[PDB]
Amino acid sequence: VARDITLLECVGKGRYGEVWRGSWQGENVAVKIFSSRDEKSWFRETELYNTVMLRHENILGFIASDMTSRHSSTQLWLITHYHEMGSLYDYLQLTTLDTVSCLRIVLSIASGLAHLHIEIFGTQGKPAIAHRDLKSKNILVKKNGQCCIADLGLAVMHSQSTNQLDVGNNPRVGTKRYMAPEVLDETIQVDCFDSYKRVDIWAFGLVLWEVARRMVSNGIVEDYKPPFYDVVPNDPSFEDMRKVVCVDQQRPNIPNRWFSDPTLTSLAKLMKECWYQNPSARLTALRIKKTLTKID
Numbered sequence: 001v002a003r004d005i006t007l008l009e010c011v012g013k014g015r016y017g018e019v020w021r022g023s024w025q026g027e028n029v030a031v032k033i034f035s036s037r038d039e040k041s042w043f044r045e046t047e048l049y050n051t052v053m054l055r056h057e058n059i060l061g062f063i064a065s066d067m068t069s070r071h072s073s074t075q076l077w078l079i080t081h082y083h084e085m086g087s088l089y090d091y092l093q094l095t096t097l098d099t100v101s102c103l104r105i106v107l108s109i110a111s112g113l114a115h116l117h118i119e120i121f122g123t124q125g126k127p128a129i130a131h132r133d134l135k136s137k138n139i140l141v142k143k144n145g146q147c148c149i150a151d152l153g154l155a156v157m158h159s160q161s162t163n164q165l166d167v168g169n170n171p172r173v174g175t176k177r178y179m180a181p182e183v184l185d186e187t188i189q190v191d192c193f194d195s196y197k198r199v200d201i202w203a204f205g206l207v208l209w210e211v212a213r214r215m216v217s218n219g220i221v222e223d224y225k226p227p228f229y230d231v232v233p234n235d236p237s238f239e240d241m242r243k244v245v246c247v248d249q250q251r252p253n254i255p256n257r258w259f260s261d262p263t264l265t266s267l268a269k270l271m272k273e274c275w276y277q278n279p280s281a282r283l284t285a286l287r288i289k290k291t292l293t294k295i296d
């Protein structure tokens, strides 16, 4: 419960709220305190962690939900494991990677995404889940080099047994930088569950690009950069994204030095197969996981 947690330092702040390192019984925990404008995401994520009972070594480990009243307002808390290395966005700016380190990160992310997408049938089986806002800032780096996925407030669920679709009721929109072309020009079929899985794939390809840039080969390595850093400004608008992703059909450039390394070359082909304008031509999360397991 919140009254037993000592907030020790703020490690994040934004439109979503803020993220704190706290102590509970003398050991670290992560507390996300949701902004007023993002209450729906707390409700959605509490449903997944509590009712569906989501857990997996590549999904941020849940501890508890709670409401606490403070300063004459009521706050919505989400308490989870603490990872001192921060998010992949922070980690990649402080270190380069070797071949084995680079492959763990991208294999563990694909392993997390596959768990979400795949339905487990039976008595109390988890439905299929699409994330819908995957990015490097809501993926965490664990001390064993593997990653885990967080920030599930936009998720959509599906069960083929009943074949009903639960899109929830959240006014939040995805991060514009990572938006997929069928989103930016409003052709995505909102009634078909596969549509949301193919959105996660597009975003996964971008994160794969972000990480591969940091792997060293033959003494060469790129600085960290976010997707489309060279053609859109910070906090880009819906219109900016569409000009780049739809009108000009642009994609993150493949650095030429990648073509003198066998791992980076196999990862480049995988990226491009996540980036088709035609959403149904993209690979599945399971396909990606399998391919990454055989690359070395």
Ligand SMILES: N#CCNC(=O)c1ccc(-c2ccnc(Nc3ccc(N4CCOCC4)cc3)n2)cc1
Binding pocket: 011, 012, 014, 016, 019, 030, 032, 060, 080, 081, 082, 083, 084, 085, 086, 087, 090, 137, 138, 140, 150, 151
């Ligand atoms: N933008 C955006 C959305 N991000 C999140 O919702 C989010 C971010 C982080 C965590 C989270 C979870 C567990 N542990 C941690 N640890 C953490 C440690 C260091 C940092 N720092 C980043 C800034 O500089 C100092 C290190 C951030 C998070 N974060 C959970 C949700």
